[PDB]
């Protein structure tokens, strides 16, 4: 430790947001245990990766160009069009020409250092893939769009460098609890629950004696319990409980990241339920030793199957994750864990079949994963894979080989997944893990991935008490490999966030609760952003959201404080790229008030959703918007261009306190597209995007929605907004979307009937995946709601993916849900007020 080794470690600890070094709320090694730990998987990596594509993060994909798209290219052939200072020049090329292929065939079109570099962004094309398959190319052909691409010196590989570095059972004492003060209800009274726990399946649970609720309660007595120290599994929590009714819990884990008992003498402080979620399963203490309750406790310690058995197995395996099993099922899975074996689906199931609480049958658990090569040779199912990472399992071997799975998927499908992957890590018993290390590898490999795992570790650690000590070892861990360079810029981003978000807050407080922004609120909005600017503000910073994107200067004039409740900034900057073929600008919506974590969690699976979609050649153009969450109930969110909401819209010519009426949408529509042919491909759009938003809403539950949160671009695309947020319509389509496709008002439509064949086909195409769609939907709801119940809030998709039907009964069951939106009209979208 020179300074030098502390100076680097200062800096660290404000791109992280917390210090890793403060071990004044830990009551053991674990967490710098974790910090060395991670050191030989992080090196590793680093000394591994290639220096020139980890500094050109091509974002590519092996996947197959889509039906559409392919329809886009006319003659096997691509237009691209080159540029070198005031120069441009286009090139017919070919789908499968390499970025190497397409250079030269432009100097024999009339030295090695010059790359296919695109125009307004840092995004190379470059390595050894066929154009089609970037994804910039691919985001051109969906588009409508052309391809630009500037020709220049590949970037120096060296600015990326990184930096030199017993029989007995078991008993629990339970000495008393203390709390500062109570003053909450008079008396009442209270004992400590103590459950033994696994995968969230308790396996022991004692009580103590019930006392009077008063602000020191001591018992002080051994609880004893069922289980013997040496059938204790590793990952094993003692769970401690303080009912009256649930008020407090805190975990202990019985085995140590040295597979050694916890022994000794614990106080250890609580966190209080505040009236199924991640959050109670934390090994981690509260920090808030002051006004928290407190506990302390010592520690002293080959056959052939029945034809109708075969059978009654295979119906249990080709069951939902969310179908509960019985003790007969388990006790069928178990028995006949070898053929159970053969069924990479059945694994979930069978590890959910195991007694974790005796050490024999934990054993032969390991003996049955030995004989793992009919797992090995599956193919990756990322739903089944996912299932094995969630709150039902706990031990490592089982996590491992889920992970291990994981581990050929490639970069672009890592994105689709990083998300609920960083989340997933709170259901892991021990802060090194597998998963913790693939996450890391991951990122390391690639910066687009290191990234986004930066702004979503960073989300957690800066309003996730009971999980940022675990997430800021790991970002630490990223932080000290992805080069100095990545560090010079994340640096810069959290400067500009900080300094936009005390604007918000300032600018907020200001404003009442009352429906207008005041001329000396813009005044003082204008004031700061050139008080800041003008600073204070770098002359330049990757939108995060969209890290290709540079933003340089703010547009002061463009600037405003927004029609909302939530009085959320709208931010525009000019674009620091000369190269940009537009002048268009970069719009950021920074707003405190809403959780835009459980945005981002539904952003995410929308992009899923299309991914599924895509792989059966369907594009509902869903436009799921960039929002990064940065701290407690603030973040930033992306301004989709040429966009309006369709309240809006409605209150038009019309007025504010009435009415709706069916059109409007219609001549919006027609006013804002120049020729009639503009016009329908925006009729088309809406046929789409609108379909794509009712089946995705319905599936998530989150249909019924005011049009203030729908909104619509000015060339037909549809897009739900602000999930927030939290007589019953199962989604939003109301006579003014019909209108537009064409029948008022209970007829039919060339255009509703394409409509209703779009929504069928993608519903039959998210059921095919309805595996995978009920453990996203199942984490979510655990790691990023309120309180959940682990019956029927997750059973809702259950429901909604109408699970055990045939093609025929879902297409009926859907056609029924556009048919009740038909039926109530303007209902529910009136009764709101
Ligand atoms: C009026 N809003 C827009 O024009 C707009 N809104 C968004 C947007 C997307 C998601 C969310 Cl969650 C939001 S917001 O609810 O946080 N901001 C907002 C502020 C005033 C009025 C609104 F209707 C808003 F949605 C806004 C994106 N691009 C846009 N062009």
Same mark, same amino acid.
């Given at each position: 430790?020179?300074?030098?080794?502390?100076?680097?470690?200062?800096?660290?600890?404000?791109?992280?947001?917390?210090?890793?070094?403060?071990?004044?709320?830990?009551?053991?090694?674990?967490?710098?245990?974790?910090?060395?730990?991670?050191?030989?998987?992080?090196?590793?990596?680093?000394?591994?990766?290639?220096?020139?594509?980890?500094?050109?993060?091509?974002?590519?994909?092996?996947?197959?160009?889509?039906?559409?798209?392919?329809?886009?290219?006319?003659?096997?052939?691509?237009?691209?069009?080159?540029?070198?200072?005031?120069?441009?020049?286009?090139?017919?090329?070919?789908?499968?020409?390499?970025?190497?292929?397409?250079?030269?065939?432009?100097?024999?079109?009339?030295?090695?250092?010059?790359?296919?570099?695109?125009?307004?962004?840092?995004?190379?094309?470059?390595?050894?893939?066929?154009?089609?398959?970037?994804?910039?190319?691919?985001?051109?052909?969906?588009?409508?769009?052309?391809?630009?691409?500037?020709?220049? !010196?590949? #970037?120096? +590989?060296?600015?990326? *460098? $990184?930096?030199?570095?017993?029989?007995?059972? &078991?008993?629990? @004492? %339970?000495?008393?609890?203390?709390?500062?003060?109570?003053?909450?209800?008079?008396?009442?009274?209270?004992?400590?629950?103590?459950?033994?726990?696994?995968?969230?399946?308790?396996?022991?649970?004692?009580? !103590?004696? #019930?006392? +009077?609720?008063?602000? *020191? $309660?001591?018992?002080?007595?051994?609880?004893? &319990?069922?289980? @013997? %120290?040496?059938?204790?599994?590793?990952?094993?929590?003692?769970?401690?409980?303080?009912?009256?009714?649930?008020?407090?819990?805190?975990?202990?884990?019985?085995?140590?990241?040295?597979?050694?008992?916890?022994?000794?003498?614990?106080?250890?402080?609580?966190?209080?339920?505040?009236?199924?979620?991640?959050?109670?399963?934390?090994?981690?203490?509260?920090?808030?030793?002051?006004?928290?309750?407190?506990?302390?406790?010592?520690?002293?310690?080959?056959?052939?199957?029945?034809?109708?058995?075969?059978?009654?197995?295979?119906?249990?395996?080709?069951?939902?994750?969310?179908?509960?099993?019985?003790?007969?099922?388990?006790?069928?899975?178990?028995?006949?864990?070898?053929?159970?074996?053969?069924?990479?689906?059945?694994?979930?199931?069978?590890?959910?079949?195991?007694?974790?609480?005796?050490?024999?049958?934990?054993?032969?658990?390991?003996?049955?994963?030995?004989?793992?090569?009919?797992?090995?040779?599956?193919?990756?199912?990322?739903?089944?894979?996912?299932?094995?990472?969630?709150?039902?399992?706990?031990?490592?071997?089982?996590?491992?080989?889920?992970?291990?799975?994981?581990?050929?998927?490639?970069?672009?499908?890592?994105?689709?997944?990083?998300?609920?992957?960083?989340?997933?890590?709170?259901?892991?018993?021990?802060?090194?893990?597998?998963?913790?290390?693939?996450?890391?590898?991951?990122?390391?490999?690639?910066?687009?991935?290191?990234?986004?795992?930066?702004?979503?570790?960073?989300?957690?650690?800066?309003?996730?008490?009971?999980?940022?000590?675990?997430?800021?070892?790991?970002?630490?861990?990223?932080?000290?490999?992805?080069?100095?360079?990545?560090?010079?810029?994340?640096?810069?981003?959290?400067?500009?966030?900080?300094?936009?978000?005390?604007?918000?807050?300032?600018?907020?407080?200001?404003?009442?609760?009352?429906?207008?922004?005041?001329?000396?609120?813009?005044?003082?909005?204008?004031?700061?952003?050139?008080?800041?600017?003008?600073?204070?503000?770098?002359?330049?910073?990757?939108?995060?959201?969209?890290?290709?994107?540079?933003?340089?200067?703010?547009?002061?004039?463009?600037?405003?404080?927004?029609?909302?409740?939530?009085?959320?900034?709208?931010?525009?900057?000019?674009?620091?790229?000369?190269?940009?073929?537009?002048?268009?600008?970069?719009?950021?919506?920074?707003?405190?008030?809403?959780?835009?974590?459980?945005?981002?969690?539904?952003?995410?699976?929308?992009?899923?959703?299309?991914?599924?979609?895509?792989?059966?050649?369907?594009?509902?153009?869903?436009?799921?918007?960039?929002?990064?969450?940065?701290?407690?109930?603030?973040?930033?969110?992306?301004?989709?261009?040429?966009?309006?909401?369709?309240?809006?819209?409605?209150?038009?010519?019309?007025?504010?306190?009435?009415?709706?009426?069916?059109?409007?949408?219609?001549?919006?529509?027609?006013?804002?597209?120049?020729?009639?042919?503009?016009?329908?491909?925006?009729?088309?759009?809406?046929?789409?995007?609108?379909?794509?938003?009712?089946?995705?809403?319905?599936?998530?539950?989150?249909?019924?929605?005011?049009?203030?949160?729908?909104?619509?671009?000015?060339?037909?695309?549809?897009?739900?907004?602000?999930?927030?947020?939290?007589?019953?319509?199962?989604?939003?389509?109301?006579?003014?979307?019909?209108?537009?496709?064409?029948?008022?008002?209970?007829?039919?439509?060339?255009?509703?009937?394409?409509?209703?064949?779009?929504?069928?086909?993608?519903?039959?195409?998210?059921?095919?995946?309805?595996?995978?769609?009920?453990?996203?939907?199942?984490?979510?709801?655990?790691?990023?709601?309120?309180?959940?119940?682990?019956?029927?809030?997750?059973?809702?998709?259950?429901?909604?993916?109408?699970?055990?039907?045939?093609?025929?009964?879902?297409?009926?069951?859907?056609?029924?849900?556009?048919?009740?939106?038909?039926?109530?009209?303007?209902?529910?979208?009136?009764?709101?007020?």
């Amino acid at each position: 430790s020179s300074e030098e080794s502390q100076a680097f470690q200062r800096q660290l600890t404000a791109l992280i947001g917390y210090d890793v070094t403060d071990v004044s709320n830990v009551h053991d090694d674990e967490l710098e245990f974790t910090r060395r730990g991670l050191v030989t998987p992080r090196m590793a990596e680093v000394a591994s990766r290639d220096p020139k594509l980890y500094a050109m993060h091509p974002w590519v994909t092996s996947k197959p160009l889509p039906e559409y798209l392919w329809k886009k290219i006319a003659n096997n052939c691509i237009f691209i069009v080159i540029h070198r200072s005031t120069t441009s020049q286009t090139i017919k090329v070919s789908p499968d020409d390499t970025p190497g292929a397409i250079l030269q065939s432009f100097f024999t079109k009339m030295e090695q250092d010059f790359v296919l570099r695109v125009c307004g962004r840092d995004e190379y094309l470059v390595g050894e893939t066929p154009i089609k398959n970037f994804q910039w190319v691919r985001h051109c052909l969906k588009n409508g769009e052309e391809i630009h691409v500037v020709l220049d !010196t590949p #970037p120096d +590989p060296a600015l990326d *460098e $990184v930096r030199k570095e017993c029989d007995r059972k &078991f008993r629990v @004492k %339970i000495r008393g609890i203390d709390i500062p003060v109570l003053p909450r209800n008079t008396d009442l009274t209270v004992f400590v629950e103590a459950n033994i726990q696994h995968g969230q399946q308790v396996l022991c649970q004692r009580r !103590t004696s #019930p006392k +009077p609720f008063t602000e *020191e $309660v001591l018992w002080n007595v051994w609880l004893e &319990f069922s289980i @013997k %120290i040496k059938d204790l599994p590793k990952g094993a929590l003692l769970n401690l409980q303080i009912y009256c009714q649930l008020l407090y819990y805190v975990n202990l884990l019985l085995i140590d990241h040295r597979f050694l008992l916890r022994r000794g003498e614990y106080v250890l402080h609580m966190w209080q339920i505040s009236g199924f979620n991640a959050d109670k399963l934390t090994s981690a203490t509260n920090p808030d030793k002051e006004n928290s309750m407190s506990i302390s406790i010592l520690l002293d310690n080959r056959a052939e199957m029945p034809n109708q058995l075969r059978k009654q197995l295979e119906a249990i395996i080709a069951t939902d994750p969310l179908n509960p099993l019985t003790a007969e099922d388990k006790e069928l899975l178990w028995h006949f864990r070898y053929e159970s074996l053969k069924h990479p689906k059945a694994y979930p199931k069978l590890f959910s079949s195991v007694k974790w609480g005796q050490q024999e049958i934990v054993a032969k658990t390991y003996q049955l994963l030995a004989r793992r090569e009919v797992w090995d040779q599956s193919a990756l199912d990322v739903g089944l894979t996912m299932q094995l990472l969630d709150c039902n399992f706990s031990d490592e071997n089982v996590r491992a080989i889920a992970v291990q799975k994981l581990e050929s998927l490639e970069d672009d499908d890592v994105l689709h997944y990083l998300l609920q992957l960083v989340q997933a890590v709170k259901f892991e018993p021990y802060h090194d893990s597998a998963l913790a290390r693939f996450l890391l590898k991951r990122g390391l490999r690639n910066k687009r991935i290191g990234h986004f795992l930066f702004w979503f570790l960073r989300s957690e650690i800066a309003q996730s008490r009971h999980y940022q000590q675990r997430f800021a070892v790991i970002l630490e861990a990223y932080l000290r490999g992805c080069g100095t360079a990545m560090l010079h810029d994340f640096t810069q981003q959290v400067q500009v966030i900080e300094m936009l978000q005390k604007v918000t807050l300032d600018i907020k407080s200001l404003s009442a609760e009352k429906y207008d922004v005041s001329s000396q609120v813009i005044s003082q909005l204008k004031q700061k952003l050139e008080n800041l600017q003008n600073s204070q503000l770098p002359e330049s910073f990757r939108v995060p959201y969209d890290p290709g994107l540079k933003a340089g200067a703010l547009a002061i004039e463009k600037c405003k404080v927004m029609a909302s409740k939530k009085k959320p900034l709208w931010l525009e900057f000019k674009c620091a790229d000369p190269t940009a073929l537009s002048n268009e600008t970069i719009g950021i919506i920074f707003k405190h008030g809403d959780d835009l974590r459980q945005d981002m969690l539904i952003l995410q699976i929308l992009r899923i959703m299309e991914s599924i979609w895509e792989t059966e050649s369907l594009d509902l153009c869903l436009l799921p918007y960039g929002c990064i969450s940065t701290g407690d109930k603030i973040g930033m969110i992306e301004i989709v261009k040429d966009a309006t909401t369709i309240a809006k819209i409605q209150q038009s010519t019309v007025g504010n306190t009435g009415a709706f009426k069916d059109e409007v949408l219609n001549h919006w529509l027609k006013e804002k597209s120049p020729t009639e042919e503009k016009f329908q491909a925006a009729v088309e759009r809406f046929v789409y995007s609108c379909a794509g938003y009712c089946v995705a809403t319905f599936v998530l539950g989150i249909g019924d929605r005011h049009n203030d949160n729908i909104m619509i671009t000015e060339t037909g695309n549809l897009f739900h907004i602000d999930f927030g947020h939290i007589e019953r319509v199962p989604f939003v389509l109301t006579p003014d979307f019909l209108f537009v496709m064409g029948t008022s008002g209970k007829k039919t439509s060339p255009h509703f009937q394409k409509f209703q064949d779009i929504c069928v086909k993608a519903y039959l195409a998210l059921r095919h995946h309805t595996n995978l769609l009920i453990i996203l939907f199942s984490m979510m709801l655990m790691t990023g709601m309120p309180q959940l119940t682990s019956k029927e809030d997750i059973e809702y998709i259950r429901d909604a993916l109408t699970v055990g039907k045939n093609e025929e009964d879902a297409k009926k069951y859907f056609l029924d849900q556009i048919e009740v939106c038909r039926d109530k009209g303007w209902t529910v979208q009136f009764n709101w007020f």
